[PDB]
Amino acid sequence: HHHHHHMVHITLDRNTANSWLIISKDRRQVRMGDTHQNVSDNKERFSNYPMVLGAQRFSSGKMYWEVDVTQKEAWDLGVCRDSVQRKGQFSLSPENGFWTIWLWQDSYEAGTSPQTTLHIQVPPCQIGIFVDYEAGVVSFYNITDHGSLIYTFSECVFAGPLRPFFNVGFNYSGGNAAPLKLCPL
Ligand SMILES: CNS(=O)(=O)Cc1cc(C)on1
């Protein structure tokens, strides 16, 4: 792919984070804490899952960024509508305002309804995310495997401003403590 020149500098919005998340001082890394991180509750925080949004809002143009997922067992990545539900249980689907992929139990799936099996020969250490607002496209690339296509959502109905979306996943196993990191341009 030739999307690298649409690179945007993404930072994490602390106020949207689940109360157990630790966001680095530079707002470029997030990991699951082993306890509540002593922050006040607010209506923006994801209550049920270890999720957080990027600060940046997109309503036009072409945007590209990369995320490090090294040594993680579980995560969700992509983009969501600014107005997605924060409280209670929900599924990651376009109907709910999410355009995402994930790793769970040694398989990669796209967050369609129902979910779609991905075909990945080389487990990714970094994921590229491309959004074309006007075209209605969200694409995912395997940086570890020469930027090979993972998945394309086409005919997307964003229906609002988009925010980068992140889930560091739970760490019941003690093998999923590693952070998500926004990789440098
Ligand atoms: C790639 N197919 S899609 O993203 O699910 C299309 C869609 C459905 C709704 C709702 O908003 N966009």
The CATH number linked to 29 is 2.60.120.920
Q: Which of 155, 158, 165 to mutate to test the pocket of ligand 1 (most atoms within 8 A of CB)?
A: 155
Resolution of the coordinates in A?
1.6
Tally Cβ neighbours within 10 Å of residue 46: 22
Total of domains in the chain:
1
**Beta-ladder partners of 181:** 29, 68
- Phi then psi for residue 4, to 5 deg, are -50, -40
User: Which residue, among 10, 6, 42, 7, has the nearest Cα to 19 in the 3D structure?
Assistant: 42
Index of the ligand 1 atom closest to the CA of residue 152: 1
Q: Is 88 left (phi over 0), alpha (psi -120 to 50) or beta?
A: left
Q: In what order do the strands lie in the sheet with 62-68?
A: 21-23, 29-32, 180-182, 62-68, 126-132, 137-142, 148-153
The alpha carbon of 10 and the centre of ligand 1 are apart by a number of angstroms equal to: 24
- Phi then psi for residue 95, to 5 deg, are -55, -35
**Beta-ladder partners of 97:** none
CA 123 to chain centre: 17
Pocket (CB within 6 angstroms of ligand 1): 94-95, 99, 153-157
Q: Is 135 left (phi over 0), alpha (psi -120 to 50) or beta?
A: alpha
User: Which residue, among 124, 107, 125, has the nearest Cα to 116 in the 3D structure?
Assistant: 107
Which residue segment(s) compose the domain that 177 sits in?
Answer: 4-182
Take residue 111 and report the two structure tokens written for it: 């967050």
> What is the SS3 assignment for 91-149?
CCCHHHCEEEEEEECCEEEECCCCCEECCCCCCCCEEEEEEECCCCEEEEEEHHHCCEE
Contacts of residue 121, Cβ cutoff 8 Å, sequence gap at least 6: 145
